[PDB]
Every structure is written in structure tokens, then in C-alpha cells.
Amino acid sequence: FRGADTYSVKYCEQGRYEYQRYLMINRFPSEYKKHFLSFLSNIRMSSGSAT
């Protein structure tokens, strides 16, 4: 039985996004430069008149 009565009650006691844990993701220095640039030029404009 896969129904709702099979799981415990405690799944619905939870606040949102509290299952998340702190994620340390590092990456190459080169890739930081690439990514920061990308986000910058995306913040300026993502699309031509469409922004």
C-alpha cells in the first residue's frame, strides 16, 4: 500500500525548506570568474526588448 496512511504523520509537521542542509559547493577559480560574469550580464539584461 502506497497510500497516505502508510507514511507517518510527522511529514506534515514540517516547516518549509527545513529539510535542506548547508551546502558548501566550491569550484575552480576560473569557474567563479565565468559564473560571476554570467550573472552580471544577466542582471544587466537577460533579453533584448523582452526584459
Binding site: 502506497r2 558548501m24 559547493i25 575552480f28 569557474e31
Partner: protein, 190 residues
């Protein structure tokens, strides 16, 4: 429906309620080996194939799978697996090139235990610090030459004995006494 018996089947086109839609691959085929060669003459010097050969990789019993958790991932946070390696410098015959022996890990889930294997890398040291028998930190990088993707990031332990040994004009390390094994008997006297 894989959970229904041979006789219980009605339609083969759909799952009525839920579950996994499963194709049966026929595992027992009685596959056989064809023998095309005489036991005397087999057309290979080092190895002979007389039976059905097990195939695949990771489909291979007993399963040997990549183990991310070892010393290297213990110390480092790697952006990509194998982006950092700690090893020893073995030989420098090539300018601005340090060969490095490194250990990594394999897991056998059948026996629940790990093995350490070893692998050589070419690392790029500009400025030629590394003396044979250094403990070095090594990183993934730009493609440099045909075989060098790694560069020497830091010397953890230098070889002080080896350096002083060089300063005196001697080789860093004595050259190994015997080379690779042979199947012959070399009679060389005096």
C-alpha cells in the same frame, strides 16, 4: 506486471494501477562458448581464452565500484572528482614535468571492503622544484601537453636528503637494482 504469475496474465500492454513497467530480459539463455582453436596453438602470447568471457564494467561480478570517500576527499572539497590528488614524485626525466604516484579507492560491496589502487600522473612544475621523493599536492587544469592535465599546486613535504644529495652532484635517488621481470634466465658472470 512483474508481480503477477505466468497464469495470472491477461493484457501485455499496460499497468492497470501502478508499479514498475518492466521488460523481461531473458537471463537464462544457456549461452555457450564456441571453440575455434587448438589447445596447442592459441593466437596470443600472454593469455588464452577457453571459455565464455564475462563482460561489461560495473556489470562485472564481483562488483567493484568507485569510492569517493578516501583520504583525498577527506582532506579536500573537490569541485570535480579527481580535481585534487596527493602523491609522491616518482622520477623527473622530463623538463618541467614531475611524474606522481597517487592512491585511490575501490569498494567491493559483496565483501563489504575497500582496496587501494595506484595510478601515475604527469604534473607540470614550472621552475623545477620537485625532487624525486617529494610529497606533493596536485590539481586538475588546462590541457598542457598530450598527457599532462595536472599541475603541482604545492609541495607538502620536500625531500631535504634528496636535495642535499643533488647539491653534491649525485643523483637524487639510487637507480633501482633490477628492472622488470623476465621469463628467461640471464647467465651473466663477472
Amino acid at each position: 506486471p512483474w508481480w503477477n504469475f505466468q497464469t495470472e496474465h491477461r493484457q501485455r500492454c499496460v499497468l492497470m494501477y501502478g508499479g514498475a513497467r518492466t521488460k523481461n530480459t531473458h537471463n537464462a539463455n544457456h549461452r555457450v562458448f564456441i571453440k575455434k582453436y587448438k589447445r596447442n596453438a592459441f593466437p596470443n602470447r600472454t593469455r588464452h581464452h577457453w571459455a565464455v568471457s564475462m563482460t561489461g564494467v560495473l556489470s562485472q561480478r564481483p562488483r567493484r565500484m568507485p569510492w569517493p570517500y578516501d583520504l583525498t576527499s577527506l582532506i579536500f572539497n573537490q569541485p570535480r572528482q579527481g580535481s585534487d590528488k596527493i602523491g609522491y614524485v616518482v622520477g623527473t626525466s622530463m623538463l618541467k614535468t614531475a611524474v606522481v604516484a597517487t592512491n585511490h579507492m575501490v569498494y567491493y560491496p559483496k565483501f563489504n571492503q575497500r582496496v587501494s589502487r595506484t595510478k601515475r600522473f604527469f604534473a607540470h612544475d614550472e621552475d623545477l622544484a620537485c625532487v624525486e621523493g617529494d610529497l606533493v599536492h596536485i590539481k586538475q587544469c588546462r590541457k598542457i601537453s598530450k598527457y599532462k592535465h595536472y599541475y603541482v599546486f604545492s609541495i607538502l613535504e620536500p625531500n631535504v636528503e634528496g636535495r642535499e644529495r643533488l647539491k653534491l652532484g649525485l643523483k637524487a635517488v639510487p637507480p633501482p637494482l633490477f628492472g622488470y621481470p623476465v621469463s628467461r634466465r640471464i647467465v651473466k658472470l663477472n
